[PDB]
PDB file of C-alpha atoms and ligand atoms in Angstrom:
ATOM      1  CA  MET A1375      -0.198   0.151  -0.026  1.00  0.00           C
ATOM      2  CA  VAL A1376       1.610   3.481   1.303  1.00  0.00           C
ATOM      3  CA  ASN A1377       1.888   4.385   5.042  1.00  0.00           C
ATOM      4  CA  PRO A1378       0.858   7.769   5.604  1.00  0.00           C
ATOM      5  CA  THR A1379       3.935   9.828   6.966  1.00  0.00           C
ATOM      6  CA  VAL A1380       2.747  13.358   9.072  1.00  0.00           C
ATOM      7  CA  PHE A1381       5.039  16.140  10.953  1.00  0.00           C
ATOM      8  CA  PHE A1382       5.035  17.710  14.301  1.00  0.00           C
ATOM      9  CA  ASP A1383       6.846  21.127  14.412  1.00  0.00           C
ATOM     10  CA  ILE A1384       7.916  21.264  18.402  1.00  0.00           C
ATOM     11  CA  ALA A1385       8.639  24.580  20.469  1.00  0.00           C
ATOM     12  CA  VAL A1386       9.747  25.237  23.400  1.00  0.00           C
ATOM     13  CA  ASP A1387       7.596  28.259  24.560  1.00  0.00           C
ATOM     14  CA  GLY A1388       6.954  28.864  21.666  1.00  0.00           C
ATOM     15  CA  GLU A1389      10.844  28.871  20.344  1.00  0.00           C
ATOM     16  CA  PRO A1390      10.927  26.607  17.426  1.00  0.00           C
ATOM     17  CA  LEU A1391      12.856  23.547  18.020  1.00  0.00           C
ATOM     18  CA  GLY A1392      12.128  21.292  14.979  1.00  0.00           C
ATOM     19  CA  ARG A1393      10.749  18.894  12.952  1.00  0.00           C
ATOM     20  CA  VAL A1394       9.776  15.095  13.479  1.00  0.00           C
ATOM     21  CA  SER A1395       8.027  13.341  10.855  1.00  0.00           C
ATOM     22  CA  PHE A1396       6.419   9.964  11.426  1.00  0.00           C
ATOM     23  CA  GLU A1397       5.268   7.068   9.132  1.00  0.00           C
ATOM     24  CA  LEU A1398       2.416   5.634  10.581  1.00  0.00           C
ATOM     25  CA  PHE A1399       1.821   1.795  10.125  1.00  0.00           C
ATOM     26  CA  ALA A1400      -2.219   1.493   8.636  1.00  0.00           C
ATOM     27  CA  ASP A1401      -0.768  -1.458   6.722  1.00  0.00           C
ATOM     28  CA  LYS A1402      -0.755  -3.582  10.098  1.00  0.00           C
ATOM     29  CA  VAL A1403      -3.171  -1.161  12.533  1.00  0.00           C
ATOM     30  CA  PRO A1404      -5.085   1.028  10.081  1.00  0.00           C
ATOM     31  CA  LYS A1405      -7.646   2.280  12.562  1.00  0.00           C
ATOM     32  CA  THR A1406      -5.023   3.279  15.121  1.00  0.00           C
ATOM     33  CA  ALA A1407      -2.950   4.771  12.274  1.00  0.00           C
ATOM     34  CA  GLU A1408      -5.753   6.810  10.873  1.00  0.00           C
ATOM     35  CA  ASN A1409      -6.760   8.000  14.282  1.00  0.00           C
ATOM     36  CA  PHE A1410      -3.074   9.397  14.313  1.00  0.00           C
ATOM     37  CA  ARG A1411      -3.064  10.504  11.149  1.00  0.00           C
ATOM     38  CA  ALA A1412      -6.735  12.507  10.908  1.00  0.00           C
ATOM     39  CA  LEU A1413      -5.424  13.830  14.696  1.00  0.00           C
ATOM     40  CA  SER A1414      -2.435  15.256  12.953  1.00  0.00           C
ATOM     41  CA  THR A1415      -4.284  17.051   9.908  1.00  0.00           C
ATOM     42  CA  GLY A1416      -6.932  18.156  12.241  1.00  0.00           C
ATOM     43  CA  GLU A1417      -9.775  16.995   9.694  1.00  0.00           C
ATOM     44  CA  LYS A1418     -12.157  16.426  12.401  1.00  0.00           C
ATOM     45  CA  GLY A1419     -12.218  19.929  13.975  1.00  0.00           C
ATOM     46  CA  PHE A1420      -9.887  18.928  16.592  1.00  0.00           C
ATOM     47  CA  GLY A1421      -6.263  18.066  17.175  1.00  0.00           C
ATOM     48  CA  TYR A1422      -2.953  18.325  17.792  1.00  0.00           C
ATOM     49  CA  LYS A1423      -1.995  21.091  17.026  1.00  0.00           C
ATOM     50  CA  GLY A1424      -1.517  23.821  20.224  1.00  0.00           C
ATOM     51  CA  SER A1425      -1.528  20.410  22.480  1.00  0.00           C
ATOM     52  CA  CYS A1426       1.613  20.174  24.769  1.00  0.00           C
ATOM     53  CA  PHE A1427       4.223  17.053  25.721  1.00  0.00           C
ATOM     54  CA  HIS A1428       3.237  17.029  29.209  1.00  0.00           C
ATOM     55  CA  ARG A1429       4.984  14.058  29.993  1.00  0.00           C
ATOM     56  CA  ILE A1430       8.830  13.832  29.242  1.00  0.00           C
ATOM     57  CA  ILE A1431      11.026  11.192  30.783  1.00  0.00           C
ATOM     58  CA  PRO A1432      14.837  11.013  29.759  1.00  0.00           C
ATOM     59  CA  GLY A1433      15.901   7.768  28.755  1.00  0.00           C
ATOM     60  CA  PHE A1434      11.922   6.512  28.324  1.00  0.00           C
ATOM     61  CA  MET A1435       9.412   8.420  26.065  1.00  0.00           C
ATOM     62  CA  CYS A1436       7.950  12.088  25.285  1.00  0.00           C
ATOM     63  CA  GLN A1437       4.182  11.688  25.941  1.00  0.00           C
ATOM     64  CA  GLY A1438       1.364  14.019  24.822  1.00  0.00           C
ATOM     65  CA  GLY A1439      -1.775  14.188  22.685  1.00  0.00           C
ATOM     66  CA  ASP A1440      -4.506  16.001  25.331  1.00  0.00           C
ATOM     67  CA  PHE A1441      -5.764  18.334  23.114  1.00  0.00           C
ATOM     68  CA  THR A1442      -9.073  18.483  25.264  1.00  0.00           C
ATOM     69  CA  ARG A1443      -7.761  18.857  29.145  1.00  0.00           C
ATOM     70  CA  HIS A1444      -4.068  19.531  28.363  1.00  0.00           C
ATOM     71  CA  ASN A1445      -2.738  17.717  31.192  1.00  0.00           C
ATOM     72  CA  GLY A1446      -2.872  14.234  30.614  1.00  0.00           C
ATOM     73  CA  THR A1447      -6.204  13.553  31.541  1.00  0.00           C
ATOM     74  CA  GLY A1448      -8.385  14.108  28.302  1.00  0.00           C
ATOM     75  CA  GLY A1449      -7.641  13.900  24.591  1.00  0.00           C
ATOM     76  CA  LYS A1450     -10.065  11.740  22.212  1.00  0.00           C
ATOM     77  CA  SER A1451     -10.256   9.428  19.443  1.00  0.00           C
ATOM     78  CA  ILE A1452     -11.645  10.253  16.168  1.00  0.00           C
ATOM     79  CA  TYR A1453     -14.373   7.384  16.259  1.00  0.00           C
ATOM     80  CA  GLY A1454     -15.713   8.823  19.839  1.00  0.00           C
ATOM     81  CA  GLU A1455     -14.408   9.154  23.274  1.00  0.00           C
ATOM     82  CA  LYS A1456     -12.065   5.780  23.340  1.00  0.00           C
ATOM     83  CA  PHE A1457     -11.079   2.917  21.064  1.00  0.00           C
ATOM     84  CA  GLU A1458     -10.236  -0.918  21.800  1.00  0.00           C
ATOM     85  CA  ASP A1459      -6.988  -1.607  21.336  1.00  0.00           C
ATOM     86  CA  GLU A1460      -6.288  -2.934  17.693  1.00  0.00           C
ATOM     87  CA  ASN A1461      -3.611  -5.357  17.574  1.00  0.00           C
ATOM     88  CA  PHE A1462      -0.335  -6.245  19.689  1.00  0.00           C
ATOM     89  CA  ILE A1463       1.505  -7.010  16.480  1.00  0.00           C
ATOM     90  CA  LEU A1464       4.256  -4.350  16.445  1.00  0.00           C
ATOM     91  CA  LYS A1465       6.819  -4.043  19.519  1.00  0.00           C
ATOM     92  CA  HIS A1466       8.575  -1.409  21.268  1.00  0.00           C
ATOM     93  CA  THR A1467      11.527  -2.156  20.161  1.00  0.00           C
ATOM     94  CA  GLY A1468      14.165   1.355  20.267  1.00  0.00           C
ATOM     95  CA  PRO A1469      14.102   4.735  19.840  1.00  0.00           C
ATOM     96  CA  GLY A1470      11.597   6.111  17.397  1.00  0.00           C
ATOM     97  CA  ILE A1471       8.414   3.889  18.074  1.00  0.00           C
ATOM     98  CA  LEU A1472       5.302   5.444  18.398  1.00  0.00           C
ATOM     99  CA  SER A1473       2.732   4.112  20.298  1.00  0.00           C
ATOM    100  CA  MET A1474      -0.426   4.629  21.951  1.00  0.00           C
ATOM    101  CA  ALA A1475      -0.445   5.867  25.956  1.00  0.00           C
ATOM    102  CA  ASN A1476      -3.160   4.812  27.765  1.00  0.00           C
ATOM    103  CA  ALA A1477      -5.672   4.124  31.231  1.00  0.00           C
ATOM    104  CA  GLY A1478      -5.631   0.431  30.869  1.00  0.00           C
ATOM    105  CA  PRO A1479      -7.074  -2.194  28.087  1.00  0.00           C
ATOM    106  CA  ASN A1480      -9.600  -0.832  25.603  1.00  0.00           C
ATOM    107  CA  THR A1481      -8.815   2.753  26.528  1.00  0.00           C
ATOM    108  CA  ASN A1482      -7.034   4.406  23.750  1.00  0.00           C
ATOM    109  CA  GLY A1483      -7.793   8.085  22.818  1.00  0.00           C
ATOM    110  CA  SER A1484      -5.489  10.767  21.039  1.00  0.00           C
ATOM    111  CA  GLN A1485      -2.649  10.345  23.739  1.00  0.00           C
ATOM    112  CA  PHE A1486       0.437   8.947  22.918  1.00  0.00           C
ATOM    113  CA  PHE A1487       3.940   8.553  23.052  1.00  0.00           C
ATOM    114  CA  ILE A1488       7.373   8.654  21.147  1.00  0.00           C
ATOM    115  CA  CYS A1489       9.631   6.078  22.753  1.00  0.00           C
ATOM    116  CA  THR A1490      13.510   6.956  23.107  1.00  0.00           C
ATOM    117  CA  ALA A1491      14.665   3.627  24.086  1.00  0.00           C
ATOM    118  CA  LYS A1492      13.524   0.027  23.804  1.00  0.00           C
ATOM    119  CA  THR A1493      10.797  -0.770  26.361  1.00  0.00           C
ATOM    120  CA  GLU A1494       9.799  -4.303  26.177  1.00  0.00           C
ATOM    121  CA  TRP A1495       8.049  -3.879  29.086  1.00  0.00           C
ATOM    122  CA  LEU A1496       4.857  -2.350  27.623  1.00  0.00           C
ATOM    123  CA  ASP A1497       4.667  -4.951  24.519  1.00  0.00           C
ATOM    124  CA  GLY A1498       1.581  -6.336  24.541  1.00  0.00           C
ATOM    125  CA  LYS A1499       0.130  -3.043  27.100  1.00  0.00           C
ATOM    126  CA  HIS A1500       0.338   0.428  24.785  1.00  0.00           C
ATOM    127  CA  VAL A1501      -0.812  -0.102  20.616  1.00  0.00           C
ATOM    128  CA  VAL A1502       2.406   0.288  17.843  1.00  0.00           C
ATOM    129  CA  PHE A1503       1.554   2.299  15.436  1.00  0.00           C
ATOM    130  CA  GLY A1504       4.327   3.890  13.679  1.00  0.00           C
ATOM    131  CA  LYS A1505       7.624   5.557  14.206  1.00  0.00           C
ATOM    132  CA  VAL A1506       9.981   8.631  13.913  1.00  0.00           C
ATOM    133  CA  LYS A1507      11.557   8.963   9.869  1.00  0.00           C
ATOM    134  CA  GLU A1508      12.992  11.710  10.013  1.00  0.00           C
ATOM    135  CA  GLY A1509      14.453  14.464  13.074  1.00  0.00           C
ATOM    136  CA  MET A1510      14.884  11.803  16.381  1.00  0.00           C
ATOM    137  CA  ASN A1511      17.325  14.532  17.054  1.00  0.00           C
ATOM    138  CA  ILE A1512      14.316  16.935  18.022  1.00  0.00           C
ATOM    139  CA  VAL A1513      13.083  13.819  19.978  1.00  0.00           C
ATOM    140  CA  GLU A1514      16.194  13.923  21.767  1.00  0.00           C
ATOM    141  CA  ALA A1515      16.645  17.709  22.668  1.00  0.00           C
ATOM    142  CA  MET A1516      13.059  17.788  23.982  1.00  0.00           C
ATOM    143  CA  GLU A1517      13.778  14.810  25.836  1.00  0.00           C
ATOM    144  CA  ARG A1518      16.412  17.217  27.750  1.00  0.00           C
ATOM    145  CA  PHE A1519      13.354  19.185  29.030  1.00  0.00           C
ATOM    146  CA  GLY A1520      12.054  16.387  30.736  1.00  0.00           C
ATOM    147  CA  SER A1521      12.648  14.907  34.131  1.00  0.00           C
ATOM    148  CA  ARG A1522      12.262  11.554  36.112  1.00  0.00           C
ATOM    149  CA  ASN A1523       9.010  10.817  37.061  1.00  0.00           C
ATOM    150  CA  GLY A1524       8.106  13.245  33.791  1.00  0.00           C
ATOM    151  CA  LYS A1525       7.022  16.594  34.797  1.00  0.00           C
ATOM    152  CA  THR A1526       8.925  19.107  32.082  1.00  0.00           C
ATOM    153  CA  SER A1527      10.880  22.213  32.607  1.00  0.00           C
ATOM    154  CA  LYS A1528       9.490  24.474  29.951  1.00  0.00           C
ATOM    155  CA  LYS A1529       6.451  24.037  27.867  1.00  0.00           C
ATOM    156  CA  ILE A1530       6.925  21.311  24.835  1.00  0.00           C
ATOM    157  CA  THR A1531       3.778  22.288  22.701  1.00  0.00           C
ATOM    158  CA  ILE A1532       3.171  20.973  18.966  1.00  0.00           C
ATOM    159  CA  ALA A1533       3.173  24.222  17.080  1.00  0.00           C
ATOM    160  CA  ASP A1534       1.963  22.967  13.848  1.00  0.00           C
ATOM    161  CA  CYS A1535       1.700  19.114  12.512  1.00  0.00           C
ATOM    162  CA  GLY A1536      -0.147  18.321   9.686  1.00  0.00           C
ATOM    163  CA  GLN A1537       0.197  15.163   6.728  1.00  0.00           C
ATOM    164  CA  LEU A1538       3.450  14.904   4.139  1.00  0.00           C
ATOM    165  CA  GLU A1539       2.492  11.607   2.396  1.00  0.00           C
TER     166      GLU A1539
HETATM  167  C1  1P3 B2412       0.318   5.171  30.943  1.00  0.00           C
HETATM  168  C2  1P3 B2412       0.787   5.659  29.753  1.00  0.00           C
HETATM  169  O1  1P3 B2412       0.156   5.177  28.793  1.00  0.00           O
HETATM  170  N1  1P3 B2412       1.951   5.680  29.722  1.00  0.00           N
HETATM  171  C3  1P3 B2412       2.357   6.107  28.337  1.00  0.00           C
HETATM  172  C4  1P3 B2412       3.943   5.221  28.458  1.00  0.00           C
HETATM  173  C5  1P3 B2412       4.676   5.162  29.266  1.00  0.00           C
HETATM  174  C6  1P3 B2412       3.915   4.674  30.635  1.00  0.00           C
HETATM  175  C7  1P3 B2412       4.783   5.454  31.832  1.00  0.00           C
HETATM  176  C8  1P3 B2412       2.415   6.393  30.822  1.00  0.00           C
END
């Protein structure tokens, strides 16, 4: 087929950091890939633009996607509020993996995370659906504004986002 590609233009307290692009595995997880793709373009009237990465843990991951409450408690999918775990075919093999954040089985909304390391303990618990294609240096830069518990030292936001391919 043709896995779509989306981008995020990251900012720190408004100051431009850089662009990160992701390939979405629509071929393996079509429903999960579509949710992220649609939220990246904002076609449903809501999405990632303007939202922040509320939890960043060095050597672990960068979490974001809460465009409703903006603190890790909200966010919503394009299929209503929450949707089921599609499948656990793909694993958290290393840095760059794009996966779904959740509050337990079948509670996928809009929140997601970018791994900065292999996180195999999350395999079978979080739906992996994409991977960073370009701008891993920017993800590594974001990681420097995080902390051990996850609280960020500065506001890391998605200044702009959309579809590339
Ligand atoms: C609860 C949840 O979805 N997440 C995202 C992945 C890393 C976890 C510590 C938190």
